[model samples]
Target: TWPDKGSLYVATTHTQARYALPGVIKGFIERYPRVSLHMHQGSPTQIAEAVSKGNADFAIATEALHLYDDLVMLPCYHWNRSIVVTPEHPLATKGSVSIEELAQYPLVTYTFGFTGRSELDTAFNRAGLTPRIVFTATDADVIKTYVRLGLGVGVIASMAVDPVSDPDLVKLDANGIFSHSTTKIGFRRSTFLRSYMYDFIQRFAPHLTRDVVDTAVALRSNEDIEAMFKDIKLPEK
Candidate 1:
């Protein structure tokens, strides 16, 4: 069933594409050399739209996915945030900071509906502090670029920071500042997945075994899916 050459389309976000999916993509290509994989990167809303409209076989992201009735959300992993700044920034010297301190500076982060932006807002609201958001982008690269230009302190995924390559920037753990985010795997419930598709899912998220994924995709009810994945352990950052 896997001998013929084919193409697979994946819809995901910028952070997942850059920091998360590379190893899976590499291994998928290595195992199935004949298959050509196309990755479409966008906001979670865009990724959900691609999967809902039958444009992609796989959708992996943090938000704007569970709203679709045509798709099933499966737990893949969990990740946290970090505050990134240049060495001269006040937060860089604080070692760790709270939401009140963060609110004092202009914040540059992901756009709303992308990468747990809602959760970030909730965190600020709970602490009774409103952040002065000066810049927002869909990609962490762009946020970091603006941070380098002294636009503002950047709130981004912890994985986006590369200690070796970004020695000039300090990454302060924001794990306590905001709620942890989940990265889920989404797919059309009606789509027939080939064997290699399951392999790709397994490669991307090993906890989602072939049998577990097959059951989730086959179930007609969405509530059952929630129960199926509720107890599954998510990978830590």
Candidate 2:
């Protein structure tokens, strides 16, 4: 019904980048082989800004971009967050953990401005304890890596934990403590949403476990990436 001749640039972060959006990426590629999809990875705020600046056709972020009213967001999936510990830790057999319950153990994690990090801090503050900073890292996997060595436990998003990689860690329920940050898709509101976007969201719904076709397919060149956006009915504005 429309012409989606231009390449579509979709940017996102590692948090939900590979997992949540893979289904959409795959389905779109299969459905439309003409246009290419370009993916850029970074922090959530970084991705959000890309949409605002017209650098990307779409951006998937962990939370709403309150500061960027220039973009319109569509929430697509939900992510659960919990505290992870080495299986050897004494708390492995216990029930859910509260902020106070967690402070007793050392923490190894990245700071906020990062998706789930801020929630962990608030949990500790409300419980009246000065949050301990045993370790700080920018990478979620790095935090988990340190946990496997028995350095300290970490609070991370659920999807970030891979049972195949860090077999030594244990994921625990921190429900009442840390909050679940919903994953949402954002793009410029003035621009029209093409059919390819619908295809992505429709297929990617209910599953955040798919492998990302964008990065794995070698999008080093713009030519290779353009083929992925052919399904779009119109070029990105």
Candidate 3:
């Protein structure tokens, strides 16, 4: 028997809030109307801290989650970045662009720690090119806004771009420009997960069935947890 009435606190990053949780939240609330669900949006570090310190029941993010020693993380999906520009931008006309060519334009992207900025920087560094980042924002919408106003080229998560909503902007393919990033959902290793919590996990990432999560929580270390799921394939977004 599933408990119908309970409280669940989730901490998530901006990108996760924008792309991932809406459907999961809808499904969860529809299935368990009596449960009170609260969402706290913050940086990846803040979200990790919330779950690790027992302030939140679960944390979802793409970066900084693996750095937490006390949280057991499960991969949700893989995503890549894309370049956004107004139709007038020169690069928008190109079928494909190289890192050196992308470096020629001023960039508007995520803040230093948000999204996959580390991989973004590494990609440019490996190419021996210095990107002129004219602006940075924690929100992808803000980066697109700046790009619309001709501030610079926008480098943002591929999932954030909506062609119908952003009709004025052009999304250039950036498949090989940066390494793909994996979003994860995690929780404190010591926390007791109620039945609904497990259901929510599976709803969010179908591969994280109750048994998989239970085993992960029981593992002695993060390494052990990693090995447990080493053979399971995570979905890509």
Candidate 4:
């Protein structure tokens, strides 16, 4: 009984737009051709605010959404950061890298609030190291541009690196160096989600089945929502 005609407005971060949305968007549009969809890209705070103010149907990001009390945030997937460097860079040939080793080089990474910059800072702080960040950009491609020019090493989401497109850059696995970040999709608690909206949610994050999303929407508190999904294992990308 999916609605054949409706509209969906989604707000997402740059990383999510690049790494997450393409396939899901295609599938949803093909299955529900009459549902008009609009996507907006913005900072995590902006996207969260968009959903809070009812400007967007959903907000998806790895940061900031949890700070909003009025939205029901559901964990969609987990991802880790990776280090990108030119083949000639010193750490390029290393099997694995440590935070201290990364701190030794000038770095180019996301700006203060985008992506998992806070977690990156936390990992460095825990190691008692201050990263020498030479440049910062909101987009991973911009960070890679600087990295390519030898301004510094690039620290970005692992999913952003593709061997085919970025053959010149070597992506070092940073699995153990930094903590994994969870991307969540959120919507206003009071919004009455249309049937098509539910399908879009499941398409974006398969673990968020219709029943689970209904439970999340019905719950009175974020704490209860958290408890309900505490046992569910979200897929990592």
Candidate 3, TM-score vs. the true structure?
0.93
**Better model by TM-score, 2 or 3?**
3
- What lDDT tens digits, residue by residue, belong to model 1 across residues 1-237? 346477789999888898898888887888888888888998777787788778898898888564645787788888888899998887888889888888899999998878888889999999988889999998899999999889999999877777886777889888788999988888878878787888888888888888898888888686888787778777876
- For this target, which candidate reaches the highest lDDT against the unseen true structure? 4
Ranking by lDDT: 4, 3, 1, 2
Give each model a TM-score: 0.92, 0.77, 0.93, 0.94
Regarding lDDT, does 3 or 4 come out ahead? 4
What's the CA RMSD for each of the models? 2.0, 10.6, 1.9, 1.7
Per-prediction count of colliding residue pairs? 0, 13, 0, 0
TM-score of 4: 0.94
lDDT, residue 78, model 1: 88
Which segments of candidate 2 are over 4 A away from where they belong?
A: 1-5, 64-68, 162-166, 206-237
Selected candidate, larger TM-score, 1 vs 4: 4
Q: By TM-score, is 3 or 4 better?
A: 4
Best by TM-score: 4
Displacement of the residue 193 alpha carbon in candidate 1, Å: 1.7
lDDT of 2 at 151: 79
